[PDB]
């Protein structure tokens, strides 16, 4: 690995610089190098790993959606034939997106999840696993689509089960997990009622627990609660 010669602490430091410079591909490469040192990640380090890959794959997803739409229009009734180029380039971006998702899933499987014993780390990594399988599901069209969807669902479900036992309903990781699982239900699993019920219930149980929080924790939790509410407003 091209980061094998760099100190773990230097990789972390450079990931933070890359974030400041909005160099998310560099940031992801630095954090991959840090993971591959083999030590567990602290809370801050888990969040740097996630920021980096969410931004990389997020940009790929946006590009893929632009291209897939152009491709869809090209296949409408009165559309002039323009050759293979739109499909080819959509496939290029798709393959690059799948490759990044596979890279993240590979770090989780070797060996982040198996060493994660505390609820905060284990839920975080299972949520990551659900998210990157969800991104694979967004572009899947073949014979493994069902298995990709079930891999996302299974990861999210295991994370939900742990989070409900071990975290308060206002914990930001738990809230973000519920938010993303609700998006999975709505956008991937063709289950809008499940998405709505999960969001509603998550929001209401968090509301009832806000009284226990400091001002700073209240701000963190209510920010994610607002996203649940925004989706409920869109979906109902």
């Amino acid at each position: 690995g091209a980061m094998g010669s760099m100190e773990r602490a230097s990789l972390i430091q450079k990931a933070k610089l890359a974030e400041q410079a909005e160099r998310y591909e560099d940031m992801a490469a630095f954090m991959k190098g840090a993971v591959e040192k083999g030590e567990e990640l602290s809370c801050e380090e888990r969040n740097l790993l996630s920021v980096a890959y969410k931004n990389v794959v997020g940009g790929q997803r946006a590009a893929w959606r632009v291209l897939s739409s152009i491709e869809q229009k090209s296949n409408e009734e009165g559309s002039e034939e323009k050759g293979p180029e739109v499909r080819e380039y959509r496939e290029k971006v798709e393959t690059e997106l799948q490759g990044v998702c596979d890279t993240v899933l590979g770090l989780l499987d070797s060996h982040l999840i198996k060493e994660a014993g505390d609820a905060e780390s284990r839920v975080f990594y299972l949520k990551m696993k659900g998210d990157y399988y969800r991104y694979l599901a967004e572009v899947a069209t073949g014979d493994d689509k069902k298995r990709i969807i079930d891999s996302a669902r299974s990861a999210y479900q295991e994370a939900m089960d742990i989070s409900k036992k071990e975290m308060p309903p206002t914990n930001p990781i738990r809230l973000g997990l519920a938010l993303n699982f609700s998006v999975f239900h709505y956008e991937i699993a063709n289950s809008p009622e499940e998405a709505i019920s999960l969001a509603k219930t998550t929001f209401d149980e968090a509301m009832a627990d806000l009284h226990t929080l400091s001002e700073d924790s209240y701000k963190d939790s209510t920010l994610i609660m607002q996203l649940l509410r925004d989706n409920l407003t869109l979906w109902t």
Partner: peptide, 7 residues
């Protein structure tokens, strides 16, 4: 619509 990419 999904979790913020940064805390």
């Amino acid at each position: 619509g999904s979790e913020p990419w940064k805390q």
